Design a protein around this ligand. Structure first.
Ligand SMILES: *[C@@H]1O[C@H](CO)[C@@H](O)[C@H](O)[C@H]1NC(C)=O
Ligand SMILES: *[C@@H]1O[C@H](CO)[C@@H](O)[C@H](O)[C@H]1NC(C)=O
Lengths: 49, 107, 78
């Protein structure tokens, strides 16, 4: 994932959403239950980020 | 618990019915209305959330169905195809229950 | 339908109409070195080698997976 001109590569066990999509300009109004494309609520177990 | 009523349960052609939700809870993640007795998203009609106050439509939105804050669904023109069952999905804390079903008839 | 989890999707959706992805008129061209990648941990100079690895086939066709939208998301995309 590109963010702010850096690459947020993360080989990680994400519970991926059924309707995934990204945004150019995403905004969430403090709503912590919204996920763009993955809705893990715990730290997901992985090897590199 | 949650109860759903059709007012009126029998509607004439091209009139108004109100899918009146009763005793809905408060801290819901979101909710949406589902055509038929299924939960596949292509029969989801309109999806409105309580905590960000935006509504969005599904594939089967015919365009004349108003979704309200109390969960109620208002129809504008009752068509003959819209006879059948309707299921109201609710989600909370990334966990769901689909236990709000309703069926009416048109004459 | 990628994945398995239902999420609070804050965008519109409609299964109105879909197409095949626009297979591009451009084909993979490797004569400018595009499509290749450097060997790890070696440098060659002024030479020509027969190497191997993982590479695109020349003359095949690309794909445009870059779907787009404004506020609605097509369900038959997934
Ligand atoms: C990497 O970049 C992102 C920018 O989206 C930033 O939020 C994050 O803190 C950076 N660092 C790490 C270790 O992920
Ligand atoms: C629900 O969506 C319709 C358009 O489909 C819009 O006119 C209406 O204002 C929305 N309801 C609310 C409470 O914003």
């Amino acid at each position: 994932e590109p963010y702010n001109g850096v690459i947020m590569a993360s080989v990680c066990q994400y519970t991926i959403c059924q309707l995934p999509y990204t945004d150019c300009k995403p905004n969430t109004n403090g709503n912590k239950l919204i996920g763009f494309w993955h809705t893990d609520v715990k730290p997901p177990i992985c090897v590199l980020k | 618990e949650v109860t759903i009523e059709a007012v009126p349960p029998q509607v004439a052609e091209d009139n108004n019915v109100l899918l009146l939700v009763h005793n809905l809870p408060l801290a819901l993640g979101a909710f949406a209305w589902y055509k038929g007795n299924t939960t596949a998203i292509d029969k989801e009609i309109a999806r409105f959330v309580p905590n960000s106050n935006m509504n969005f439509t599904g594939q089967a939105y015919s365009g004349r169905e108003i979704i309200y804050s109390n969960g109620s669904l208002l129809f504008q023109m009752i068509t003959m195809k819209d006879m059948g069952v309707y299921t109201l999905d609710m989600t909370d804390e990334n966990y769901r229950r689909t236990q709000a079903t309703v069926r009416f008839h048109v004459h | 339908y990628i994945g398995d989890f239902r999420c609070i999707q804050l965008v519109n959706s409609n299964g109105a109409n879909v197409s095949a992805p626009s297979i591009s008129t451009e084909t993979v061209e490797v004569s400018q070195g595009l499509g290749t990648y450097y060997v790890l941990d070696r440098v060659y100079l002024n030479a020509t080698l027969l190497l191997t690895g993982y590479y695109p086939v020349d003359g095949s066709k690309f794909r445009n997976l870059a779907l787009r939208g404004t506020n609605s998301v097509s369900l038959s995309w997934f």
